[PDB]
Amino acid sequence: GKPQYMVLVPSLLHTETTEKGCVLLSYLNETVTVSASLESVRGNRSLFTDLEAENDVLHCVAFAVPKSSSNEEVMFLTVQVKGPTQEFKKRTTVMVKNEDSLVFVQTDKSIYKPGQTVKFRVVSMDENFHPLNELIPLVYIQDPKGNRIAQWQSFQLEGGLKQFSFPLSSEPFQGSYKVVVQKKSGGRTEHPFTVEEFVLPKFEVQVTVPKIITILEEEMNVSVCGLYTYGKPVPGHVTVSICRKYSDASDCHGEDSQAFCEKFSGQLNSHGCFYQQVKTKVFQLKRKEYEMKLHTEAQIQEEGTVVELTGRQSSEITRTITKLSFVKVDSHFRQGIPFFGQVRLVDGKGVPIPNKVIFIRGNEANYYSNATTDEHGLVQFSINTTNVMGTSLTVRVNYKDRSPCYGYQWVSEEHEEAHHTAYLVFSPSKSFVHLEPMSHELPCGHTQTVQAHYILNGGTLLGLKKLSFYYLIMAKGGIVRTGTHGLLVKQEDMKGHFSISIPVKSDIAPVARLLIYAVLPTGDVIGDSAKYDVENCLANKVDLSFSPSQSLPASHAHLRVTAAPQSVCALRAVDQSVLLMKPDAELSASSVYNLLPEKDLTGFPGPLNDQDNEDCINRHNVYINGITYTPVSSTNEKDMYSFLEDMGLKAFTNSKIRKPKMCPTVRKYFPETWIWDLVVVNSAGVAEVGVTVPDTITEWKAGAFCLSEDAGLGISSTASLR
């Protein structure tokens, strides 16, 4: 039983963050001590972390790395296995980096009227999304002309945040402003808001247009309404219009692509709207004609108020029409296990169409086989594995060949096909581990289980029944979870299916890179790796519960917020008129996840770091005795190193991982922002008694967010009051 040693570490080790790295001391020859030592390229900077290793156990260890003055520095990491008998060691270059915090600013409003005080609040968190009491050197408000008008220097956030206030001038500059926070590193996080003179609107203009429409069309349904509070509509003489811009060729003194359009007119019905169908034939929507805009003009009657609303200008006439795409197909196949792959049909408004023939094509195993779309336009299938390495798989459908005159010339309306090219893994002892792929948004707070298939035909060699299988999951550019499974085999045992559990917790960010691998006594490693899209979730579950529904210019309204047992929660409530005016800058879970640096780590830091040479056996043989001797070149065969590289972590090891090729009261007033504040949650929730506003002609939409040291941060569902 030939021993082996192995240590995995991420190629990008964040300085001043607890960076996990795992160890597998596989065979029981003796008691040994593993030890990684990180040290500088030039200079005497040096570290050492002793890792307590046990035989055939995947013991893990974390470590914070010391600060570097250079934003990104490259350093030497060498692991060393010290033992009475054997002494092994290996070196590689790793990149350290001081990856700064993710911060954001919430403003009381999106727009301001002059003289009105601006209130904003700034907050900072780490990759693990939890309040971080950072020291921010600067925050300042930049006017539209560019002059810094106000600033707050060198300050620390108390509860992972701080609220601020700037009174606007009586005579300011009409236009767009922006608050900016320069972190210690320099990373300017900007956030805008407009300033102008305006009369707020009492009513919205609900415009309804097909989100996307087919090129081949006669007519289409379209409708426009107008409400404000408790859905009470208003009557008015609407004047809607529907135009298009062929090619945005920038005016040329004859309108900016103002191309032909049928305008309309009519009156709105009480307890309703105005509905209409319009013939698309007039627009032609062919010959380099691209998109459409749909203006409105609900000229409210019983007033001289003309509130327009250029709604749904995203009504598309896409070039594509009949399409298909893949869903769950392996990119890694093997010559000893027929691979499986699913496809789905889609067209226009992602409509799946059942009972329509498809035409699969496989320039390899010659799998030219038809099938029909089952319910929900879909077809799963498998093919026989017996050919060369790279296998190209295309799928054609309905009418691939057709006569749209010329290709490029005046108009194209292609019908996109779907295609893929899977490559095989290098099998050492004809043994391999496949991972069943389940690509689709995995829901958080709900466990998933993945199926693993195993082929060990004379892969045992030593013939001992007990064989350890290990797996790791990674996210945010670092290893998060670890485990194992002990498959107890025969001497030769090729057939079998077994699955491993995985709780979708949310500490796994959007990327979820999962690997699995075996450790054979033949000195070989066999495994697989896969990527699972995880839904973007927060840990602190919070919900805004506005208690006295509707009410009237009353007093004391119970507004509650359930959250973490102890958490600071920032509340924001404003008239849905100023929100109607300019929509507030998106602040959701999805807004925060995009703010995270290193959303995924795939490949080593390539532009900075490079290395692929430690055994030029490539040029040793200038040729090999084929039936007619031929000289070598290079290759694209997939192996194990490639899976660890795709993961973004490198490995110090003794067993065969990389392929040997190592050479190439009746009174009204007070309306703008009702409640801008924060509170502390008791062990459960917290009820805020807000006194009601009197010029309540409209609904009061309100939201919030929380910060907790344990459960990270959270975001409430915008609860209203009519």
Partner: protein, 344 residues
């Protein structure tokens, strides 16, 4: 670089030449930088449509001279660190460094293309860049260099004597004062003295060691060799002993005589180490402030003779005789600056 270095230590220098030199120096640096690879390496051609692969001797060479160069003209430290890093990627614990030398013309070096002779060069170049002995690349190189000495020390047939000379300065420079004298004793015994001038050479006209490699580099082996060993003699960590430097002065008498008529030496890698070894001797011997150097030579029987060596005299063979039949003489030197006393 090494001529500018040598001219400065001798004291014979001119600003009309320093300026004429720096021009050919700053230009060549920037012209050299033009053949650097993305990974920090350097290739004979350059980067001809991205197809070119790195030669581990030229990179190491570039680095040794960019370490030196950096003293007179300013060099960007990034280029050295970039190279140093690439050299470590081509570093195997056993056998220290990998020979990736893909070139057309080999008169450029003296290395026997051997992993021992190559690592023996990279290890000097790395040490010559001020790097600590506790560095992980030098730790895996020094260990290879001890194994290379004990294997080459088994007998006369031990990669001949070229390898043997580089192992001296490398050790001396590293600080194994003990292993330095261990290799230096077996080289000193294997030396070839002459008319007051010692040196080192391969087997004159081989005859016995037969099996040619490209062409004969023997006239360049013997030049490089001595000068490499001169550096090992001069390189003692506290300071070189009177016994070290007096033996070093004899090596100097040979190399200085064995000089190319026009200027320089046979190859190029042997011209470079000769000037570096001379200048490093020249630093130890010469003095700047203590212009006076008094000497007194007397005998038991009333003999007396004394001289004043200094900047106006050093360039002159001051001689004296008076032959008393049974010699019992005392040489007394005073002041500052060295004096060489040859009695025949």
């Amino acid at each position: 670089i090494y001529v500018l270095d040598y001219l400065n230590e001798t004291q014979q220098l001119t600003p009309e030449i320093k300026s004429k030199a720096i021009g050919y120096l700053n230009t060549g640096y920037q012209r050299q930088l033009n053949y650097k690879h993305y990974d920090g390496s350097y290739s004979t051609f350059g980067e001809r449509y991205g197809r070119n692969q790195g030669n581990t001797w030229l990179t190491a060479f570039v680095l040794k001279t960019f370490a030196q160069a950096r003293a007179y003209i300013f060099i960007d430290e990034a280029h050295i660190t970039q190279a140093l890093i690439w050299l470590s990627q081509r570093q195997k614990d056993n056998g220290c460094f990998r020979s990736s030398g893909s070139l057309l013309n080999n008169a450029i070096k003296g290395g026997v293309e051997d992993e021992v002779t190559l690592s023996a060069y990279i290890t000097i170049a790395l040490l010559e860049i001020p790097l600590t002995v506790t560095h992980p690349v030098v730790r895996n190189a020094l260990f290879c260099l001890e194994s290379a000495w004990k294997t080459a020390q088994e007998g006369d047939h031990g990669s001949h004597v070229y390898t043997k000379a580089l192992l001296a300065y490398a050790f001396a420079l590293a600080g194994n004062q003990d292993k330095r004298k261990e290799v230096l004793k077996s080289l000193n015994e294997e030396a070839v003295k002459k008319d007051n001038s010692v040196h080192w050479e391969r087997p004159q006209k081989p005859k016995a060691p037969v099996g040619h490699f490209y062409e004969p580099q023997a006239p360049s082996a013997e030049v490089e060799m001595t000068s490499y060993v001169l550096l090992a003699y001069l390189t003692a960590q506290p300071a070189p002993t009177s016994e070290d430097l007096t033996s070093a002065t004899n090596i100097v008498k040979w190399i200085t005589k064995q000089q190319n008529a026009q200027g320089g030496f046979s190859s190029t890698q042997d011209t470079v180490v000769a000037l570096h070894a001379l200048s490093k001797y020249g630093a130890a011997t010469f003095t700047r402030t203590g212009k006076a150097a008094q000497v007194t030579i007397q005998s038991s029987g009333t003999f007396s003779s004394k001289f004043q060596v200094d900047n106006n005299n050093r360039l002159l063979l001051q001689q004296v005789s008076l032959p008393e039949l049974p010699g019992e003489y005392s040489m007394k030197v005073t002041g500052e600056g060295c004096v060489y006393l040859q009695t025949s």
